[PDB]
């Protein structure tokens, strides 16, 4: 059984590329207004959110736009839960709880790559900075697939975000700040 490793980038070139993208992306994401993301998404980009189907803070805020094809069967309801076009994509994102991610603790896997495609997954944690779940720690995996951007950047054409509650194991770790010992 291969030994579980962290982030996988393949080339330092894509590492710096992707990591840079995430810095800019989440700088805007946690800013208070995610509108600046309209430049990160393609005109006909897609976005959808999913949460665990299964007493920590509530995810009721994500339940409304939760897309689970395994559980939800109606083709028309399936279709509506999928945000299409950057306008709808970003309009939706701006409705989500304000956030503050731990970008530098992100574990990234670049799984696919061609001259026009770059698929990669992001795993990490983020605090909700307000609302009824303020100070709560969420965990998430987000998959983007990008096409080359006119500026050596990335244009996200596909974005699937999975939001969950950090497990007691993760929380313990994230918040630990013990005195140094030999």
């Amino acid at each position: 059984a291969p030994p579980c490793k962290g982030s996988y980038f393949g080339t330092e070139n894509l590492k710096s590329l992707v990591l840079h993208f995430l810095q800019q992306y989440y700088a805007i994401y946690d800013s208070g207004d995610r509108q600046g993301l309209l430049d990160a998404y393609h005109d006909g980009a897609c976005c959808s959110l999913s949460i665990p189907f299964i007493a920590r803070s509530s995810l009721a805020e994500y339940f409304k736009d939760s897309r689970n094809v395994k559980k939800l069967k109606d083709p028309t309801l399936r279709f509506r839960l999928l945000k299409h076009t950057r306008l709808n994509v970003v309009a939706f994102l701006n409705e989500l709880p304000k956030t503050q991610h731990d970008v530098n603790s992100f574990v990234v896997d670049i799984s696919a790559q061609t001259s026009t495609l770059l698929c990669f997954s992001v795993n990490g944690v983020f605090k909700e900075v307000d609302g009824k779940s303020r100070d709560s720690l969420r965990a998430f995996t987000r998959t983007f697939i990008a096409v080359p951007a006119s500026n050596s950047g990335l244009c996200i054409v596909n974005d699937e975000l999975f939001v969950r509650n950090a497990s007691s194991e993760e929380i313990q770790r994230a918040f630990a700040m013990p005195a140094p010992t030999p």
Partner: peptide
């Protein structure tokens, strides 16, 4: 296959 080049 470089991301972007073609």
């Amino acid at each position: 296959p470089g991301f972007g080049q073609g």
